[PDB]
Amino acid sequence: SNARVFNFAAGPATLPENVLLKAQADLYNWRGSGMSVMEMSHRGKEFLSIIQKAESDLRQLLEIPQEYSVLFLQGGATTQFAALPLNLCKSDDTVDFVVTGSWGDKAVKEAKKYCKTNVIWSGKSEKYTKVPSFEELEQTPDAKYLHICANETIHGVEFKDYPVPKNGFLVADMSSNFCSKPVDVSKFGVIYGGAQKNVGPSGVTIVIIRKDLIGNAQDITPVMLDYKIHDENSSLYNTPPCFGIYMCGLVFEDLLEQGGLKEVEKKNQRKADLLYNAIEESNGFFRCPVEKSVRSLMNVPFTLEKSELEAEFIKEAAKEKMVQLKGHRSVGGMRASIYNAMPLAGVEKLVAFMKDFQAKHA
Amino acid sequence: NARVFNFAAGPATLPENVLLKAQADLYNWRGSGMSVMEMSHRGKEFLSIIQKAESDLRQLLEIPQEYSVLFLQGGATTQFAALPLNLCKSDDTVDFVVTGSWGDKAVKEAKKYCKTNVIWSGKSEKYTKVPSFEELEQTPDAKYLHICANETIHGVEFKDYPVPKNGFLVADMSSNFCSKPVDVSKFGVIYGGAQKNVGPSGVTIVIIRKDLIGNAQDITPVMLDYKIHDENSSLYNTPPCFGIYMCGLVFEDLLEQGGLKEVEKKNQRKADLLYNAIEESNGFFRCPVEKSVRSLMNVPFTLEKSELEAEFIKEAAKEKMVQLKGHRSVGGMRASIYNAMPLAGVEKLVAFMKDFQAKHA
């Protein structure tokens, strides 16, 4: 519409209006430099200030320890599915996986090209609705690392606490909950994520990697997938995604202005609770299949008992400016993605719409 | 706080009308209710944008349906690995004609994945020439022949193309992409980063003959696999949506300019102004590149009085002409004069050169 809508898309996703308007204001001529960020040399002093400020702001938000590197890369999280075992394993090493949704399953399949994989536990048998108890996971005695997807974007399953790796280090795909809450980074060897879900536009992927794990990639690693190359060149080995990194920088600066990630988590909890409570109080009209203690604050899948009404629910919500609510083809129903930048008012509008819908169709 | 004349070699200057369109669309693209930066890549609005970008590019370069057009991430440098990973077995051979340092980087990365033969290198004469094609000793069972069509640092550009004795021709056209017509049917693959001539950094275009798609090496990352990208129309994973949108705006505007025959005329005219100024300078300024292969896009030049190069660059920047410093190896200057560099910018540099020479000769 002529007014902006409430955008429940799962990735790419909604961004803060103030960030967008700042980008608009500066698009033709950034800070009297005489050019757009889209036209800046990546080796020039203006872009250097942008990428350095983005890294500094991110380090502050997540309280990233000095002994970790921060890389700003292209190729999405799917490229990292290959880069991780290429950098961190030899061809006969094993990576352990806990698979809580389909994103972890894709990571397994790609890793098989480059090392051995072991899926300790899969949620598939119960339609990806739970996280296992950690103590009873049988880890591979010589596994290089343990891989999790911290927020399974399709399935709505989120780690709250983290497993402790037995032999190696912990790797987490945090694409769809990145900068939604504090994380004790020191518990991980690698955290990675596409920016597009929670912290910027598509085209930028962030890798936070303990410095002692950088180096000794497999010989077949493309130079563009090599962590040492990226780290020693500060993400400027080749031409980076300049504009994407600038946009991420705006988002980080704004999250700090909001009070940092403790405050961000409080708002995310508050708005998620309105939606989960609406569902739970609906006497089964709406249903969420995910086990209560691991319900994602970012992605909320739900269905109707009267599934024949789902298409109508989605179409009518779009007429009321709540878009991209359709769920995954495997389950149908709906998926409300409610990332950092989803206004509280959008969640309130959806909850009120659900009320009205239920009353009309009970 | 006026806009400057921006001679950077990549990323690079973009058309002002395109930047202003992007500004106007940024918060809410066509009353869709969101930015391009917030669109689902599987939604109807983004699908219209990527499809229009492909169509417009096919019209502009005259890319027939026997070729796929892929919009990817990773830069041209990712394609240095993807090409042999997709197109070669580990014991196949690829021939290289190396006319500058970008081709040399392509050779180094290909060695990881297959055998390489550098059948000609310009290095011994400081990368100033293109070989005579008839005299190249091509490998009889080469899978493909790789060239860099425009060597961005060295200013050496192919005007005519060699005929592969076996296999097909692959060209890195990063720094001359959509600067002039190209007979696409002569090639197996044309590739290039968008950031020099057609958009911002973060998108790479790959134009690939459909019969060449598939059969990648088993070690090929899914994100480097041409069959995966082709069968999913560049939407296998989350594409660089905003970058593709920007490339689309550029392609639309190049069509509005009259297409690539017209773009080439403008490029030739403004390059000639600069090269003529260099050659008429009685040696004060010098271009090392052999005349018939001088790039229309990247113009490297030095001063006879090398000690004045720093003053030249600094004073030019005071006159709103920025990013003219040349490569560390040969010093001097490099004026990158891509499609979107205004004619007035080249005129100003030419005037600046004339005044500088009068002052210091």
Residue numbers in the entry:
A (entry chain A): 69 to 430
B (entry chain B): 70 to 430
Sentences from the paper on this structure:
PSATs are PLP-dependent enzymes that catalyze the second step of the phosphorylated pathway – reversible conversion of 3-PHP to PSer in a Glu-linked reaction. In this work, we describe a structure of the isoform 1 of chloroplastic PSAT from A. thaliana (At), which is further referred to in the manuscript as AtPSAT1. The three crystal structures of AtPSAT1 present snapshots along the catalytic event showing PLP internal aldimine state, complex with PMP after the first half-reaction and PSer-PLP geminal diamine intermediate state.
The PLP prosthetic group creates a Schiff base (internal aldimine) between C4′ and Nζ of K265, the residue placed in the coil between β9 and β10. PLP is bound inside the active pocket with its pyridoxal ring π-stacked with W171 on the re-face of the cofactor. Hydrogen bonds of PLP phosphate group also involve interactions with the side chain amide of Q264 and the hydroxyl group of T146. Altogether, before the catalytic event, the PLP prosthetic group in AtPSAT1 structure presents a very conserved conformation in the internal aldimine state similar to that observed in other ATs, where C4′ atom of PLP is exposed to the entrance of the pocket.
